[PDB]
Amino acid sequence: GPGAYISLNYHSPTIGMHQNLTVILPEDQSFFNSDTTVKPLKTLMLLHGLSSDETTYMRYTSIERYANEHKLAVIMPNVDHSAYANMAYGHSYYDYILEVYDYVHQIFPLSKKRDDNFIAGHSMGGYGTIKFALTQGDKFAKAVPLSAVFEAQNLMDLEWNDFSKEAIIGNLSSVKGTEHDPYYLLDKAVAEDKQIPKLLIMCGKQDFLYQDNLDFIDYLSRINVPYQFEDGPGDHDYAYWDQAIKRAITWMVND
Amino acid sequence: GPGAYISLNYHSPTIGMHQNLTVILPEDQSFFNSDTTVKPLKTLMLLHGLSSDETTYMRYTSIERYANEHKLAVIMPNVDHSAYANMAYGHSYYDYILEVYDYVHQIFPLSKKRDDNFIAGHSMGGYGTIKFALTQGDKFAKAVPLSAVFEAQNLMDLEWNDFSKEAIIGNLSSVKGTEHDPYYLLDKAVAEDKQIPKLLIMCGKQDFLYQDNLDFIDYLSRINVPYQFEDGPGDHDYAYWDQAIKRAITWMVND
Numbered sequence: 001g002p003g004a005y006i007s008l009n010y011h012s013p014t015i016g017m018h019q020n021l022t023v024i025l026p027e028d029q030s031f032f033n034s035d036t037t038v039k040p041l042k043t044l045m046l047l048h049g050l051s052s053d054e055t056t057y058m059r060y061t062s063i064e065r066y067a068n069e070h071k072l073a074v075i076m077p078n079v080d081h082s083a084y085a086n087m088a089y090g091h092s093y094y095d096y097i098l099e100v101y102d103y104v105h106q107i108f109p110l111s112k113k114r115d116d117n118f119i120a121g122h123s124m125g126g127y128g129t130i131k132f133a134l135t136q137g138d139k140f141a142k143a144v145p146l147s148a149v150f151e152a153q154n155l156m157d158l159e160w161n162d163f164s165k166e167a168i169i170g171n172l173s174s175v176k177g178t179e180h181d182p183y184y185l186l187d188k189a190v191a192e193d194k195q196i197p198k199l200l201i202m203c204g205k206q207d208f209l210y211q212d213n214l215d216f217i218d219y220l221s222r223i224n225v226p227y228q229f230e231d232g233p234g235d236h237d238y239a240y241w242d243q244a245i246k247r248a249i250t251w252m253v254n255d
Numbered sequence: 256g257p258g259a260y261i262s263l264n265y266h267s268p269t270i271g272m273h274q275n276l277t278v279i280l281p282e283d284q285s286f287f288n289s290d291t292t293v294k295p296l297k298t299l300m301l302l303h304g305l306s307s308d309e310t311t312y313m314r315y316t317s318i319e320r321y322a323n324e325h326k327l328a329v330i331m332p333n334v335d336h337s338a339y340a341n342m343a344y345g346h347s348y349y350d351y352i353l354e355v356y357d358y359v360h361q362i363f364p365l366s367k368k369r370d371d372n373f374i375a376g377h378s379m380g381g382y383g384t385i386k387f388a389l390t391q392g393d394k395f396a397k398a399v400p401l402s403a404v405f406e407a408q409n410l411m412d413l414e415w416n417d418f419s420k421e422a423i424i425g426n427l428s429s430v431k432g433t434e435h436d437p438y439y440l441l442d443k444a445v446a447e448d449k450q451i452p453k454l455l456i457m458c459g460k461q462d463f464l465y466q467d468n469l470d471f472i473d474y475l476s477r478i479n480v481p482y483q484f485e486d487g488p489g490d491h492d493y494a495y496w497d498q499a500i501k502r503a504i505t506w507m508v509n510d
């Protein structure tokens with residue numbers, strides 16, 4: 001039924017500034033009883049897309065209703081225009097996510113088991129999710145990119161309002177074959193026999209990264225990595241991602 | 256040293272509604288290392304006065320600055336116009352404070368030791384502080400009423416904007432000898448051999464309640480209860496309580 005909506009602001013030693021962070025914490029009966037041990041909750045790291053921040057998932061979906069139904073803690077950080085990268089000219093936003101994961105597991109009643117921790121996100125956050133799935137596999141059991149960018153050149157060459165490509169990648173004019181390419185990180189993951197989280201890849205059929213998503217899931221089957229692809233009517237809007245994260249949260253908590 | 260500013264909104268099972276709550280959580284090095292076990296922080300329960308709520312101590316003082324220098328967590332809840340009582344016609348806001356206490360000790364890295372937990376507050380919060388000090392002495396080692404109300408008839412018969420006495424005490428025609436009388440709770444604490452927390456009572460000398468404060472500390476001395484009383488130039492405003500809460504926070508965490 002109920003839960004806590006928590007808004008944090010702390011000085012980050014990683015990115016060197018105060019930063020906002022919002023956390024959904026569903027209510028457990030352990031939390032109100034002083035004589036019982038706390039039961040740790042499953043936790044979702046939820047990554048916003050470009051132009052969004054730590055507030056927009058709460059504002060534009062009804063995710064806390066979905067999270068309280070399945071008693072899932074949700075962590076929503078803010079990474080600005082970074083594409084979740086340790087930026088060449090800017091903040092160390094790849095490392096910031098591992099700091100956010102470490103902090104809220106130390107301070108909130110969250111379970112540190114691999115089988116209890118998930119990660120998801122949309123657009124840039126979906127591209128962020130597939131980066132951490134392929135590079136931080138022992139931290140997360142399942143990963144759900146929604147309408148992700150899988151060929152990062154489409155995100156880097158995107159002409160978005162005040163978006164700075166050179167701030168992330170520096171003087172490089174291609175991201176193919178580097179730590180920004182999910183195809184390279186996928187190749188390195190199968191090469192080193194690294195744990196890949198359980199993949200649920202969601203994208204609306206009328207999205208523009210739909211064909212971007214079709215290329216990625218086909219590449220996954222050619223290298224024998226299991227996934228689950230759910231399509232259907234949808235565009236690149238919070239109307240899709242509201243319904244998508246509702247089915248996504250139900251998918252991750254039941255196994 | 257830096258810290259986290261945390262604002263919670265959860266459905267409270269005690270008062271039967273969603274309620275806002277603010278938390279200062281100073282940063283320890285423990286919080287960012289997952290190979291470290293978390294060292295729990297000292298905790299202060301900070302109670303606002305009449306017409307205020309959970310936001311006003313941050314807005315009108317610099318308490319998070321003072322709390323972070325002394326690594327002290329600060330818990331600031333909202334109790335409306337209740338005078339921290341289980342109201343006859345209203346919410347059970349006495350029990351709510353025990354619920355807030357139980358909730359943040361379970362979900363935040365706070366020390367559950369008696370010598371690490373203090374309680375404080377101004378005006379009506381000073382009335383709440385001395386009510387919980389004399390009836391929950393096992394939960395607090397130090398209690399700091401600032402500019403407080405000790406003669407409960409002065410608060411019940413107060414003509415403040417929209418304040419309702421009968422919502423608190425109902426048809427009662429005097430507070431003496433009841434659970435609303437802090438002098439009565441002091442007698443019952445002495446008689447039942449209940450541990451009285453260490454008291455620091457502060458009131459400015461131009462306050463209306465200065466003579467009210469002298470009557471309680473005079474009575475306190477007459478039944479052989481130790482206290483420390485600090486006075487000086489001060490009035491009934493957040494300018495005095497900003498400077499006083501800095502003095503109180505330094506007093507409570509040392510020795």
Ligand SMILES: *[C@H](O)CCCCCC
Pocket residue numbers: 049050051122123124125149154155158209
């Ligand atoms: C990503 O957050 C949304 C912008 C669309 C990117 C298409 C490459």
Ligand SMILES: *[C@H](O)CCCCCC
Pocket residue numbers: 303304305306377378379380404409410413463464
């Ligand atoms: C206390 O919260 C502020 C009002 C002054 C009360 C004096 C009886």
